[PDB]
Amino acid sequence: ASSTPQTNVDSMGGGDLTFEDLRDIKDVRDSGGQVAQLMDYKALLNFGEGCEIHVEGDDETKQLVDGEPMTLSEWLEDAFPHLDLLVLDLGGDALWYPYAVGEIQETITGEFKEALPAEPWTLMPESDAQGKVQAWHQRTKTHGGYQTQTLPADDLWHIVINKASARDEVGISEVLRNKDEIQAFKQNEAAINQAIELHGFPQRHVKVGKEDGAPVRDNDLRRVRTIFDPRTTDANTAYFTGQDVDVETLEAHNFDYSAIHEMDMRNLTTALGLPLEAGNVGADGLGSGKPAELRFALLKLAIKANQRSFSVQFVERVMRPVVRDYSPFDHEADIRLEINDPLEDIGEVADLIQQVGDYMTNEQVAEKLDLPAPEDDEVADSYRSPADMEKDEAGV
Amino acid sequence: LAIKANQRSFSVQFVERVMRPVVRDYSPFDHEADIRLEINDPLEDIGEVADLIQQVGDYMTNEQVAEKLDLPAPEDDEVADSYRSPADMEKDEAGV
């Protein structure tokens, strides 16, 4: 075949998105409310449960670091101690915006310090007909004015969750993907708000004069208004009149704002791929049996796919480069980087450990139970319980 | 049924038109070998399998139990190929 690509990648010469679009996304984030909360729930379901820096066969990496042996996973824990927060920030950003992006940062001595995320709305990529980002272009406010700069696709690193193709380096924002639905939701909210004000509350109508009788003028109504004033009326007020004065009510002219609001929530949640339950709205029939199994399966599938899509890019464009350029350890070891699943149940794990423990190693049990394995190799590698080994030894 | 049909339809084409060429042109191994590609059932429940392992484990090998449980088989061939539990082998050996 070939050592360089031969198919073209469908764009050159610029627009297909801008700092203005990116700042619109930022405005959707900082303006708050239910719309922002839903996208943050989407981030939390994918990335909020935390991570672990597992490494394959790491006892083979054992090397002196500062007069004492360490492993690559220990070195990576020194490099990335707060990784749960970085995963949530990057994961959230890569759902909100088309991508998440950051720098590599160094100590005063010049050795590696951290990988540092940048404000994603401030940066846009620049690319060729071969489909690759060659530079990152930044625009930012200072003193009420603006500054502009360009940086190489070298010391910066970036991650994309959602894509137009396997080749895609620019990615898809779900905020841009569902823009019309988001506007429609906000508009329907604005409609309901005032519709309740105008139609949800009854309003009082005083009619003065007899039908086909004498006319009544504004300077007369001003005096009548001074009597029946809702500002000074009270719960047990009573009225006394001649026959030619009437009080009437414009009733609460009822409309099903609940059904509309539920339709809004249906539209927005399903557009975002969320369950309607995450919008704090329910449904009949769906709350029972195999329909529940399917909805939660579909959410698990989405989460697992997103998580694995993230782990790969973080390992391959953040962790491995850092190890390669700044570490005594070999970068080509497999980081088994996992992100936790919030739809996994410890109760199910407990039942599983009772049901099939006789066919899982103690280390396999420890992995599933989310704990360190036994400190003695044969105790970890064996299938029967460490408590079973201990009771036999105490019997001896 | 639709999922399994689609999955097997994909697997065969990926093996025959992607994997076998990749072996042929870049590998020291035989490209006409018995390659298998499987794609997972999205509606599988571990609890269903765990119940089954308790109900019929007496008639399944330790490798078949591990494969159904989505885990590695034992590191010793007769421990993997036999039907009685590895924990049962360990407790008996420790006793004897």
Cα Rg of chain A, angstroms: 32
Residues from chain B that touch A297, judged by Cβ atoms under 8 A, are 42-43
What DSSP assignment string belongs to A124-153? EEEE-TT--EEEEEEEEEETTEEEEEEEET
Which method was it determined by?
Answer: cryo-EM
Please say whether the beta carbons of A312 and A320 come within 8 A.
no
Residue B26 near chain A (CB below 8 Å): no
> Is-contact A118 A159, C-beta < 8 A?
no
Task: Provide the shortest C-alpha distance from residue B67 to chain A (in Å).
Answer: 11
Contact (Cβ atoms closer than 8 angstroms) between residue A140 and residue A146: yes
* φ and ψ at residue A333, rounded to 5 degrees: -70, 145
* DSSP string computed for A224-244: HHTTS-TTT--TT------TT
Give the whole-angstrom CA distance, residue A6 versus residue A65: 45
Q: Which are the contacts of A119, defined by CB distance < 8 A and separation ≥ 6? A: A140
Kindly state the tokens that stand for A317: 């464009």
Question: Within an 8 Å CB–CB cutoff, is residue B25 touching chain A?
Answer: yes
Helix spans in chain A (H): 19-30, 33-47, 72-79, 83-96, 174-177, 179-195, 218-225, 257-271, 290-314, 320-326, 346-356, 362-368, 377-381, 386-395
Q: What is the Cα–Cα distance from A178 to A269, expressed in whole angstroms?
A: 11
List the resolution, Å.
Answer: 2.4
User: Quick check: A249 and A204 in contact, CB under 8 A?
Assistant: yes
Sort strands A203-208 and A245-250 into parallel, antiparallel or unpaired: antiparallel
CA angle, residues A197, A203, A205, in degrees to nearest 5: 145
Cα separation, A246 vs A206, whole angstroms: 6
What phi and psi, each to the nearest 5 degrees, are found at residue A138?
A: -120, 135
CA A304 to chain B, closest CA, distance in angstroms equals 11
How many degrees, rounded to 5, is the angle at CA A248 between CA A243 and CA A251? Answer: 165
Q: What is the Cα–Cα distance from A335 to A54, expressed in whole angstroms?
A: 6
Chain A residues within 8 A of B91 when measuring between CB atoms: 384, 388
Are residues B88 and A358, on separate chains, in Cβ contact within 8 Å? yes
Whether A355 sits inside 8 A of B51 (CB atoms) is yes
Give the nearest partner residue to A297 out of B42, B66, B74, using CB atoms: B42
Rounded CA gap, B87 and A365, in Å?
Answer: 13
> What is d(CA A176, CA B15) in angstroms, rounded to the nearest whole number?
37
Q: Which residues are CB-neighbours of A341 under 8 A, at least 6 positions away?
A: A49, A300, A303, A304, A307
Check CB contact under 8 Å for A382 and B57.
no
User: Who contacts B38 (Cβ-Cβ below 8 Å, separation ≥6)?
Assistant: B7, B11
Which bin fits A50, alpha (ψ -120 to 50), beta or left (φ > 0)?
Answer: left
Question: Tokens for A67?
Answer: 């007069």
Half-sphere exposure of A353 (CA within 13 A, CB side): 16
Structure tokens at A366: 């420890």
Beta bridge partners of A204: A249
Which tokens hold the place of A359? 């066919």
Assigned token pair, A158: 């970036």
